[PDB]
Design a protein around this ligand. Structure first.
Ligand code: GTP
Ligand code: MG
Lengths: 142, 180, 10, 570, 415, 18, 198
């Protein structure tokens, strides 16, 4: 299960965050700052995998804004990367050429999509079109 | 400034008002709220959280926020004390051992300096068994007359029948509204 | 800028 | 881009040359590596307009170490410009020549420096004096061979007070790197001459003129009295550094002054208003002023004895100033202002800064330890803070109480009952250990000492080494004092620390305690529960040798850090 | 002994750098930002940084921090003074201190930086004097820099000889939460805008307590200034001899003298504030302000900042006189009063809501600050006696001066 | 006029002190 | 009722940290004033602004009762905003999620497939040791349904409850029996994950 998922920009600003572990607000902020410092202080050939606090912190940014995950040491690492790529593709398809500007303004839509896709750190739908159709149906309700 | 729109709205009815629903669990609060809103005796599971509804009568929208009587929810009544204009207390005369607990809870809720303009509204619930007391014995036991600067009103309502709801609503309207 | 660019460019 | 810029710079039109120079300057300032075009800009150097010459000189200075080989094509231009009628051009050329970090270029620049050393223009003289110091820093051997020391020495004894101050500063910088051999010190006549131009020196020249006296060592009171009288007007300088320099000079001269004469008293009285004025400077200068006060406080604390109100930290004061204010108050704390210090500490305990709260607690503890006349007030304040129900405040109060008990525990038995139930659930190692030590040493006014130690023995084997040692010491003390209610407790502690305890020091202590218990329990009362001597408090005053050296180094980096100048430079 | 004077930005970018000694590599500026971030994030942030063997001591300006790297045991006070002089020169030349002028005034900025300091030792710091040799829109340097008088350019001629003075008072009062005043310091400020012809030698004369005692008139109203700091034009020797303030005023506005003495008088404003904050239910602000100042004086623009609750919302104000506004950006009640007659008494009754949910962390108790500014009021009683304007040519000067009383560090500790 | 107190002319020296 | 886009643009227009903090405080003052008035029309914009401020690093302690009120609301946008607020600023250590059990139970039997799904997702994301105790009965009822879009949600809720309450796994054995024939990939994946967790 994904302990936490955070979408942060290269400048350090966070555009998305979703933690599945109940932690204190100050503790969560400190953990986020440490993760940003580690990711911001890492090269391009770090393998996109970090063992922070015994957690497989995987960093894979396809643009200026990066993505982060917190996977326990009980599953494969490539599965997290595949899930992140699938989520990015689904977000791009739902939005249509998703850029950084739409992420800040359309954070609610991204949060709803993430909730409908991943619940409790685990995946909810393996397909990519069924989730898009469900999100569209939910949005069309008004 | 001009208050022509306010006068026009008040000519046909503009005031709505609010209301609160507090009391011990299994005190007929949910059933009373259902009867006031719909008019049927609906059986529901114990109120883990709270129920929010509104009642339209006499051109006044009486919004009622039911609050459970759970032990873990007893100290949670302070959340509804903000932006609260009314308060209705439902007694449980069928629980002699719980009468003292209900009186203590009412006294604790009445010991708040923020909830001072909310007049007392005592509802005699469970008015269907012979063991239920009158409308004065319960008040005498609870000492409702000793509430200085508090307007209390005791009304007996039967959950199965619904008698006395109209009188209580009229009394609440008269206490809240001071016009013709 | 670098923000208006698509995440994947697809 | 680069080709277009090179073509523009290699044109015969000045209107395009100026634009190209501006673009090159902007690119270098914008963070563009334009060092590859250094030879191209070398041709466009000899220009009549001074606007492009300054930019070319700046580019060469910034691109001198990068391309030292390409810089060999500028000596002729500098030589030609070192004789222009305009003083500004000559000064700029002199400044640029000394700024070139080329080992093969300073050798040929000795002649222009010698020519400009005796220049009539004061600006040219100042530029030459600065260039001499720059060359000496770059190459001391070349400067010594050129014989610029004699010219520099005669600079102080000439007109142009700005040029004299610049020459004095250059000589001081050269002597700073010099090995003290052939010092440029002067007799009282030179000091009097420098003081004569001090009243006409500028704000920057005032510091240069006052720094020279920092190295001179007076030998007579009359000379010291005259120096003090001349430096007295320096306390009315608007510049903060000038006032600080005058204060440092007065402090240095006071080492030869006699306290019997009235000059020392006048100097002491006239220095407090200067300190008060310096305390109202900018927030950045607040830290420097506090460091200077702390350094001079340990030397002559009788000057600022009555200055206590100015040591209060302001609401908008910075954290670095707030921290120094507490240290200043602690250093100047006395029984006369004990109530004021306690009130200030009490107000400082209602803030939100955890570091500030800890500093305030430490200052209160230090003040209580230093003065025993306010011990009761400090104890009452600590009890109130503990009752305040603050985790950091509670830990600080526990630490303060533990420190006070070891220092003045004769009348500390009246607070043991209050501390018996004071939220012992805190897991701070600095507070739990202090509470355990207080309970063990003060296990007389509490009848439930054994019961309290039961809760702390659940995780004694995995709490901490210091915490485990403190708990073992408290248990041993309780067994020695009251063995009826702690007979099994001592055995359990010995079993847990001797069998299940793998700590080397802890295991040795447990074995020693078990051996003492099994050898002579009666002797343990006189061996373990003995009257320890007076605890020697760690004095905060610096060593007298370091203070004397720190006195001369006033306003420098060695004074803010309170470290010797050779222990921080690299 | 600064090695390189550089100017950074809010994003860590070095807007402009000016190496002075060259003993420190220019690449050390990169670690300054991470070092500052670490110091600030751990409470160890200080204006004087240290990158190994190189120290980066600098102050924060309006838009950028002027950090100056150094390696030797240089005078930190000298570096701070140089930075202050540079900031003053920039303010005199550029009306604003922001990044818009750093990238637009580089042509003159580089020349000013080169001329101001050479090898880490500044030589010229007067903006008025420096404006005659470095311009953004070059002749020989003026003789004023070479001459002893570096703060009064010769040859200045004006149609009239009018000098406007400003006796600005700063009332700083530190009242503890118990109701007693701890720190009550009043700092005088005599600022004059000298505009005359030639190089007059002003001879300022006032009713000083020391001067009155020396002359034998130590019986009238005399100001007993604990600290008197004259400007650069004021001669230290003349003031040290017989309290003679003789100096040449500069051309423009400048600070000549700054008195500073403690005050033992009652506050001009007495504030009686109460806080009837119910536990997460409501709060009351029984604030009563009593003007202890003279009735003939009016405090123009009275601004008594009352720190209200940070999470307070839906507030109601029941005051008597003056506009009371709560600023969410500042999170306090701004007791704004336009004109306050002396002896006036303003009573306020605050009433604001409070959420049921308690705050996660404490916020502290900010002090109540009054922003009273009553002109034509001299609390210290110091009055200007004479101003000897002497010129070689000979002219009839028309000096002017005004007394303005304002609230300085007039903060009142909360309960 | 001017906020902060009207400007007032100053004397030349202490005429009563010679 | 300021729009979320306007607030985002205003925040992006702030450069200095102090200026950004002042703008955030100015917006939060209006948000608290609107909340204290019991606003119900444009509450979505205020909720979005409060969520942005909390994510931007501003406190949101006062905005706890408003989320609870919006959760028990009837508007779909208001319900979604309340669910998002509960998922973001609501946790086990908040101590205010106990009252959310009644709202979840009320929304658990809602005929709408989105409100029930949103409530289930919120419960799974913010599951508590006591909320699952009073919500285990309703989870099993939805676990035996044939809703393909709801089967995965029920499996995720059961997995979250089992993780929070390992002693409640005995009540899930008779519900997951004979569930390996699901044609949908999501339902099969959820069943496999639940079996692996068990
Ligand atoms: N048969 C009968 N039962 C009643 C009557 N009045 C009260 N009750 C009991 O009171 C309970 C009322 O529950 P609800 O009305 O659903 O809600 P509530 O009063 O708030 O009780 P909780 O949900 O436990 O907090 C019912 O379960 C009944 O058992 C009545 O007149 N007739
Ligand atoms: Mg109910």
């Amino acid at each position: 299960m994904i302990h936490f998922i955070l979408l942060f920009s290269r400048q350090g600003k966070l555009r998305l965050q979703k933690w599945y572990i109940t932690l204190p607000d100050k503790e969560r902020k400190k953990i986020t700052r440490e993760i940003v410092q580690i990711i911001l202080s890492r090269g391009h050939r770090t393998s996109s995998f970090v063992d922070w606090k015994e957690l497989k912190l995987v960093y894979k940014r396809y643009a200026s804004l990066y993505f982060c995950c917190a996977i326990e040491n009980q599953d494969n690492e490539l599965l997290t990367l595949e899930i992140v790529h699938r989520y990015v593709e689904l977000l791009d398809k739902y939005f249509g050429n998703v850029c950084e500007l739409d992420i800040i303004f359309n954070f609610e839509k991204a949060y709803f999509i993430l909730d409908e896709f991943i619940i409790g750190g685990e995946i909810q739908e393996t397909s990519k079109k069924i989730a898009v159709k469900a999100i569209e149906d939910s949005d069309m309700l008004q | 400034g001009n208050i022509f729109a306010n006068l026009f709205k008040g000519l046909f009815g503009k005031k709505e008002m609010r209301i609160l629903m507090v009391g011990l669990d299994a005190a007929g609060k949910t059933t009373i709220l259902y009867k006031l809103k719909l008019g049927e005796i609906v059986t529901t599971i114990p109120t883990i959280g709270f129920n929010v509804e509104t009642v339209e009568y006499k051109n006044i929208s009486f919004t009622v926020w039911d609050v459970g009587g759970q032990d873990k929810i007893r100290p949670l009544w302070r959340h509804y004390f903000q932006n609260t204009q009314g308060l209705i207390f439902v007694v449980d005369s069928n629980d002699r051992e719980r009468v003292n607990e209900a009186r203590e809870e009412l006294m604790r809720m009445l010991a708040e300096d923020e909830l001072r303009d909310a007049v007392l509204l005592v509802f005699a619930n469970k008015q269907d068994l012979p063991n239920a007391m009158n409308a004065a014995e319960i008040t005498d036991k609870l000492g409702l007359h000793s509430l200085r600067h508090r307007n209390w009103y005791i009304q007996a309502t039967c959950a199965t029948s619904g008698d006395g709801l109209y009188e209580g609503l009229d009394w609440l309207s008269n206490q809240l509204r001071n016009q013709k | 800028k670098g923000e208006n660019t698509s995440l994947l460019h697809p | 881009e680069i080709f277009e810029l090179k073509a523009e710079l290699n044109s015969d039109k000045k209107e395009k040359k100026k634009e190209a120079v501006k673009k090159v300057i902007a690119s270098m300032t914008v963070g563009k590596d334009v060092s590859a075009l250094f030879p191209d800009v070398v041709n466009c150097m000899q220009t009549d307009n001074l606007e492009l010459k300054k930019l070319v000189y700046l580019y060469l200075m910034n691109y001198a170490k990068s391309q030292p080989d390409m810089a060999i094509m500028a000596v002729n231009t500098f030589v030609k410009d070192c004789e222009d009628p305009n003083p500004l051009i000559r000064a700029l050329a002199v400044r640029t020549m000394g700024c070139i970090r080329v080992d093969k270029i300073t050798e040929y620049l000795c002649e222009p420096l010698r020519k400009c050393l005796k220049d009539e223009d004061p600006y040219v003289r100042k530029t030459a004096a600065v260039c001499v110091a720059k060359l000496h820093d770059i190459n001391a051997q070349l400067v010594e061979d050129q014989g610029f020391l004699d010219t520099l020495k005669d600079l102080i004894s000439d007109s142009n007070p700005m040029v004299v101050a610049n020459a004095v500063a250059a000589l001081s910088e050269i002597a700073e790197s010099h090995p003290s051999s052939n010092l440029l010190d002067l007799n009282p006549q030179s000091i009097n001459k420098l003081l004569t131009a001090l009243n006409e020196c500028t704000e920057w020249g005032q510091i240069f003129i006052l720094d020279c006296l920092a190295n001179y060592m007076p030998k007579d009171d009359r000379e010291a009295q005259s120096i003090c009288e001349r430096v007295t007007p320096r306390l009315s300088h608007a510049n903060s550094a000038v006032v600080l320099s005058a204060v440092k000079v007065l402090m240095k001269f006071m080492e030869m002054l006699s306290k019997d004469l009235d000059y020392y008293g006048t100097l002491l009285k006239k220095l407090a208003p200067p300190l008060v004025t310096l305390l109202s400077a900018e927030p950045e200068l607040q830290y420097v002023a506090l460091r200077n006060i702390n350094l001079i406080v340990q030397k002559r604390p009788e000057i600022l004895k009555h200055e206590m109100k100015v040591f209060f930290v302001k609401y908008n004061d910075p954290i670095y100033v707030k921290l120094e204010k507490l240290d200043i108050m602690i250093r100047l704390a006395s029984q006369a202002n004990i109530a004021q210090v306690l009130a200030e500490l009490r107000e400082y305990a209602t803030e939100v800064d955890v570091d500030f709260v800890r500093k305030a607690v430490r200052a209160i503890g230090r003040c209580a330890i230093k003065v025993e006349q306010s011990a009761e007030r400090c104890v009452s304040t600590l009890l109130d803070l503990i009752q305040t129900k603050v985790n950091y405040v509670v830990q600080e109060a526990i630490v303060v109480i533990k420190d006070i008990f070891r220092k003045y525990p004769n009348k500390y038995e009246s607070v043991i009952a209050t501390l018996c139930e004071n939220l012992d659930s805190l897991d701070e190692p600095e507070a739990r250990a202090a509470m355990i030590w207080i309970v063990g040493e003060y296990a007389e006014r509490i009848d439930n000492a054994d019961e309290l130690l039961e809760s702390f023995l659940e995780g004694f084997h995995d709490k901490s080494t210091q915490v485990q040692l403190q708990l073992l010491t408290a248990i041993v003390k309780l067994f020695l004092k009251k063995p009826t209610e702690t007979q099994e407790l001592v055995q359990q502690v010995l079993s847990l620390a001797t069998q299940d305890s793998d700590n080397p020091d802890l295991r040795d202590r447990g074995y020693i305690y078990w051996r003492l218990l099994s050898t002579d329990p009666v002797a343990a009362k006189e061996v373990v529960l003995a009257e320890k001597p007076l605890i020697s408090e760690e004095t905060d005053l610096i060593e007298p040798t370091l203070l004397d050296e720190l006195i001369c180094y006033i306003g420098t980096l060695a004074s803010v850090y309170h470290k010797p100048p050779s222990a921080f430079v690299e | 002994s600064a090695s390189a004077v550089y100017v950074l930005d809010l994003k860590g970018k070095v807007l402009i750098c000016r190496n002075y000694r060259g003993d420190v590599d220019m690449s050390e500026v990169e670690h300054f930002m991470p070092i500052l971030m670490e110091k600030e994030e751990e409470g160890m942030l200080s204006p004087i940084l240290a990158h190994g063997g190189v120290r980066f001591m600098w102050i924060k300006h309006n838009n950028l921090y002027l950090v100056a790297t150094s390696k030797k045991n240089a005078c930190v006070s000298l570096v701070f003074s140089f930075l202050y002089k540079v900031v003053q020169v920039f303010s005199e030349y550029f009306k604003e201190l922001e990044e818009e002028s750093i990238r637009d005034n580089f042509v003159i900025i580089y020349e000013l930086l080169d001329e101001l300091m050479d090898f880490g030792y500044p030589q010229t710091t007067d903006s008025k004097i420096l404006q005659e040799y470095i311009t953004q829109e070059a002749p020989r340097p003026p003789a004023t820099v070479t001459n002893a008088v570096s703060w009064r350019s010769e040859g200045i001629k004006y149609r009239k000889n009018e000098v406007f003075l400003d006796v600005i008072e700063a009332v700083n009062l530190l009242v503890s939460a118990n109701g007693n005043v701890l720190r009550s310091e009043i700092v005088g400020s005599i600022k004059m805008r000298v505009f005359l012809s030639g190089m007059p030698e002003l001879r300022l004369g006032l009713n000083d307590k020391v001067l009155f005692d020396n002359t034998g008139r130590g019986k009238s109203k005399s100001v007993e200034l604990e600290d008197v700091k004259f400007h650069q034009c004021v001669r230290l020797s003349r003031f040290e001899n017989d309290r003679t303030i003789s100096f040449i005023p500069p051309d423009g506005e400048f600070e000549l003298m700054s008195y500073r003495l403690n005050t033992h008088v009652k506050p001009l404003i007495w504030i009686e504030s109460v806080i009837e904050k119910h536990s997460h239910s409501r709060i009351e602000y029984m604030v009563k302000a009593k003007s202890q100042f003279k009735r003939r004086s009016t405090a123009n623009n009275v601004e008594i900042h009352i720190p209200v609750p940070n999470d307070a919302d839906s507030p109601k104000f029941k005051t008597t006189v003056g506009s009371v506004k709560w600023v969410p950006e500042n999170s306090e009640i701004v007791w704004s009063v336009k004109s306050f007659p002396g002896g006036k008494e303003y009573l306020m009754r605050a009433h604001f809501g409070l959420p049921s949910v308690e705050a996660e962390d404490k916020e502290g108790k900010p002090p109540i600050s009054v922003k009273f500014e009553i002109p034509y009021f001299t609390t210290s009683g110091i009055q200007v006696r004479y101003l000897k304007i002497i010129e070689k040519s000979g002219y009839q000067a028309l000096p002017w001066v005004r007394y303005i009383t304002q609230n300085g560090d007039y903060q009142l500790r909360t309960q | 006029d001017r906020k902060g107190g009207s400007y007032s002319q100053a004397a030349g020296s202490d005429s009563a002190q010679s | 009722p300021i729009r979320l886009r306007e607030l985002i643009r205003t925040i992006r227009t702030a450069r200095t940290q102090a200026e950004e903090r002042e703008m955030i405080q100015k917006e939060c003052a209006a948000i608290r004033s609107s909340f204290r008035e019991e606003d119900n029309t444009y509450r979505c914009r205020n909720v979005a602004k409060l969520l942005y401020m909390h994510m931007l690093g501003y406190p949101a302690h006062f905005g706890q009762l408003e989320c609870l009120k919006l959760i028990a609301s009837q508007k779909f946008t208001d319900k979604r905003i309340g669910y998002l607020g509960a998922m973001l600023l609501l946790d086990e250590r908040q101590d205010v999620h106990l009252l959310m059990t009644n709202c979840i139970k009320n929304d658990l039997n809602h005929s709408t497939q989105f409100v029930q799904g949103l409530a289930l997702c919120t419960l799974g994301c913010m599951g508590s040791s006591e909320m699952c105790r009073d919500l285990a009965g309703e989870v099993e009822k939805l676990l035996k349904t044939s809703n393909s879009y709801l089967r995965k949600k029920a499996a995720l809720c059961a997995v979250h409850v089992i993780r929070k309450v390992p002693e409640l796994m005995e009540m899930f054995l008779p519900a997951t029996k004979n569930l390996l024939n699901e044609k949908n990939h999501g339902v099969l994946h959820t069943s496999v994950v639940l079996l692996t967790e068990m």
